[PDB]
Design a protein around this ligand. Structure first.
Ligand SMILES: Nc1ncnc2c1ncn2[C@@H]1O[C@H](CSCC[C@H](N)C(=O)O)[C@@H](O)[C@H]1O
Ligand SMILES: Nc1ncnc2c1ncn2[C@@H]1O[C@H](CSCC[C@H](N)C(=O)O)[C@@H](O)[C@H]1O
Lengths: 12, 275, 268, 12
């Protein structure tokens, strides 16, 4: 699993 | 164009609750849509995910060398995981330029592998870029962009006609200083800044081996949904001497892997003018 | 008279000042251990094949130095602890506060020097070498940071960097400007015959922005041309020696050798 | 063939 190149994102 | 019963238009990538925006931002919001260029990126990404042996190689290299390199540098080494913020048409509609508009100098800070830079580049005679990843610097140089040091671009003796700062403010160590530096070298009579930020705002500085550190400066971006966090940005930009000329909501798309044909984050994209 | 091909020096072809400060080195225990360990690594067939495959795969996209750092291969050797101590004219127990190693590579030479220092700083342009240096817990400074920290260094090492950096004369002047003056010393190693270039990605290279006028038809003639270069930066040679600059090998050779001139410099 | 990590070297 590579995912988004910008990284993981948290929430609001 | 979009309609409430349009299928596979991914409305949630583009729409917002306009009544939740402050009234000064309601006036400069620009509606984007899932357009031709966006579908070309997506169809290309879907095709790339179909090449199983390429995906498997990329995953093996990533697995083996992730402790020694950043994820960004691994992507640059492989030329994988490229991203998309806007099509040329979306860019021109946001900046209010015609397809043949040209000016002298673009500076793209934190340009990554340059595949977003390439969307903007036909509008400029000279393209400059900065990057911290060694393999991304090689990708930028293959595109013939002039890579400047991260403390060099402020000191070249010339100004820049457009400065782009796409998805960098949440990934750099000193974002307030960055915004002030941008203001200080933007050509003032006609220059514009193109700025993109993933919301919800979650900043960290990427290090090797999947590690990270907190940034040294704090951006006061606050809010409980996309609209509220956008509402906090006029004051952030005002502190750096900018006002918002236009902005839009765009999916920050990324090529995929074995598991997903692409990945998505939520970008707020602004055109700033110096004030 | 020491006659081993890697250490022998024709003293009569040195100028008179350099004859007075030359220090003879020899193939000692620490050197032979490095060579023994290198021969052993070259006998690891599957490891050498892996290194070769990865180096070919990434060769277009990375500099050779960064590929070596990524793999932890191709480490080098300039001096043993005994040779380092003999050149500096210091005891095994000797200590001072701050070492700075410019262009430190994977730090395997740095770590020979490290026991004599409280604090060790390093610079490097290669991202994966920086990883190596940080795994050894050295304090990595930017290449335009280290001379602007406000503090000085007790020993600055600049080993096999002058022929590989873009601005070597500025480098020497920058070293002079933050060396601790009363007791500070510089350790400089240079491969002769002197052939400078700046390494780029993919086996490419670029010419340096500044030229060092180092000329001669052999080691001793080239060394005779250095005192003038050093003096422009405000240094005079306190001691120097000839040492083989050794490097780990591959599937065809157990190690590789270049010819180092290794100086201890004092500020004028 | 990997060679010396400091690079290829010419002659006098
Ligand atoms: N201080 C800094 N200067 C230049 N690049 C930086 C930086 N801090 C982080 N980066 C780089 O910033 C990038 C953030 S990802 C965004 C890439 C591209 N602009 C896009 O929008 O897709 C990474 O490539 C990271 O290496
Ligand atoms: N301006 C610069 N600042 C810091 N490192 C530099 C540099 N220019 C080149 N380098 C690095 O200098 C090193 C030269 S090879 C010498 C490495 C080590 N000092 C030794 O003697 O074995 C390379 O690792 C290269 O990445």
């Amino acid at each position: 699993h590579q995912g988004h190149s910008h990284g993981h994102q948290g929430g609001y | 164009h979009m309609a409430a019963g349009g299928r596979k238009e991914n409305h949630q990538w583009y729409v917002c609750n306009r009544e939740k925006l402050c009234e000064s931002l309601q006036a400069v919001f620009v509606q984007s849509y899932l357009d031709q260029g966006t579908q070309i990126f997506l169809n290309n990404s879907i095709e790339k995910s179909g090449w199983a042996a390429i995906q498997a190689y990329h995953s093996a290299v990533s697995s083996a060398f992730s402790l020694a390199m950043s994820r960004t540098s691994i992507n640059g080494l492989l030329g994988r995981g490229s991203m998309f913020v806007f099509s040329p048409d979306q860019f021109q509609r946001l900046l209010k330029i015609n397809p043949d508009w040209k000016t002298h100098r673009l500076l793209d800070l934190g340009a990554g592998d340059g595949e977003v830079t390439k969307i903007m580049s036909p509008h400029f005679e000279e393209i400059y870029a900065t990057e911290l990843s060694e393999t991304m610097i090689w990708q930028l140089q293959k595109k013939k962009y002039r890579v400047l040091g991260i403390n060099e671009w402020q000191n070249t003796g010339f100004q820049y006609d457009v400065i782009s700062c796409l998805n960098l403010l949440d990934r750099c160590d000193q974002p307030l200083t960055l915004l002030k530096d941008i203001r200080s070298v933007l050509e003032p009579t006609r220059g514009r800044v193109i700025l993109a930020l993933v919301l919800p705002f979650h900043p960290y500085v990427e290090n090797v081996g999947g590690k990270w550190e907190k940034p040294s400066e704090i951006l006061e971006i606050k809010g409980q949904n996309w609209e509220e966090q956008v509402n906090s940005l006029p004051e952030v930009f005002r502190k750096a001497g900018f006002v918002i000329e236009a902005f839009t909501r765009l999916p920050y798309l990324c090529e995929g892997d074995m598991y997903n044909d692409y990945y998505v984050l939520d970008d707020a994209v602004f055109v700033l003018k110096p004030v």
